[PDB]
Design an enzyme around this catalytic site. Structure first.
Site, short mmCIF file in Angstrom:
data_model
loop_
_atom_site.label_atom_id
_atom_site.label_comp_id
_atom_site.label_asym_id
_atom_site.label_seq_id
_atom_site.Cartn_x
_atom_site.Cartn_y
_atom_site.Cartn_z
N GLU A 35 0.73 -1.28 -0.09
CA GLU A 35 0.09 -0.02 -0.06
C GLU A 35 0.79 1.14 -0.08
O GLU A 35 0.62 2.28 -0.82
CB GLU A 35 -0.74 -0.11 1.33
N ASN A 46 -7.66 9.11 -5.76
CA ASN A 46 -8.32 8.25 -6.35
C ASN A 46 -9.45 9.02 -7.46
O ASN A 46 -9.38 10.46 -7.26
CB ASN A 46 -9.34 7.37 -5.42
N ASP A 48 -12.47 9.21 -7.91
CA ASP A 48 -13.75 9.98 -7.39
C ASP A 48 -13.38 11.23 -6.55
O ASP A 48 -14.39 11.72 -5.89
CB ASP A 48 -14.69 9.12 -6.54
N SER A 50 -11.61 11.41 -3.83
CA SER A 50 -10.98 11.05 -2.32
C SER A 50 -9.61 10.79 -2.45
O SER A 50 -9.02 10.75 -3.53
CB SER A 50 -11.95 9.69 -1.90
N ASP A 52 -6.26 8.59 -0.53
CA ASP A 52 -5.73 7.61 0.73
C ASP A 52 -4.58 8.17 1.42
O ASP A 52 -3.50 8.67 0.76
CB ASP A 52 -5.41 6.29 -0.19
N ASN A 59 -8.77 5.61 3.30
CA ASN A 59 -9.54 6.37 2.26
C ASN A 59 -10.35 7.35 2.90
O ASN A 59 -11.32 7.06 3.76
CB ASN A 59 -10.41 5.49 1.28
#
Ligand SMILES: [Cl-]
Ligand code: NA
EC number: 3.2.1.17
Length: 129
Positions: A35, A46, A48, A50, A52, A59
C-alpha cells in the site's frame, strides 16, 4: 517516516494487530508494504476525488476528514493528516475499525491482490518481536 520491515512488525504487534480479527501479523506488514512501501507519508488520489492516506492508505471517502471530499464520511473521526504521523497509533486504531466492518482485509485492494493466499509469514521471518 519510512519503517523497516521488522521495525513496523514490532510497532504493529505492540499496538494489538497480531491476530486481530484473526489476521496474523504477516498480513498487516504485507499490506503496508504494497500500500505505502512502509512510508507513513504516502498519499494517493482516487478518481472519485477522495484520497488515501498513510501507511495503510486509508480512504477519505469513509474513514477520515480532509476537507475536500464532499459528501464523505469520517468514520474514524480524525483528520486524514493524523494518518501521516510517524506515530502509527491513529492508523492502527482506524484500521481496526475498518477490518471489523464485515469485509475483513479485503478492504485493502493490495492485500487482496498481493498478500491474500500467499505465505504472509515470510513478511515477519527473522524479526525480533
Ligand atoms: Cl475476516
Ligand atoms: Na471523509
Amino acid at each position: 517516516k519510512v519503517f523497516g520491515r521488522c521495525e513496523l512488525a514490532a510497532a504493529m504487534k505492540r499496538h494489538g494487530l497480531d491476530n486481530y480479527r484473526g489476521y496474523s501479523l504477516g498480513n498487516w506488514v504485507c499490506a503496508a508494504k504494497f500500500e505505502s512501501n512502509f512510508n507513513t507519508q504516502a498519499t494517493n488520489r482516487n478518481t472519485d476525488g477522495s484520497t488515501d492516506y498513510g501507511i495503510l492508505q486509508i480512504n477519505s471517502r469513509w474513514w477520515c476528514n480532509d476537507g475536500r471530499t464532499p459528501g464523505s464520511r469520517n468514520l474514524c473521526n480524525i483528520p486524514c493528516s493524523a494518518l501521516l504521523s510517524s506515530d502509527i497509533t491513529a492508523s492502527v486504531n482506524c484500521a481496526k475499525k475498518i477490518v471489523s466492518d464485515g469485509n475483513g482485509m479485503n478492504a485493502w485492494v493490495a492485500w487482496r491482490n498481493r498478500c491474500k493466499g500467499t505465505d504472509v509469514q515470510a513478511w515477519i521471518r527473522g524479526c525480533r518481536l
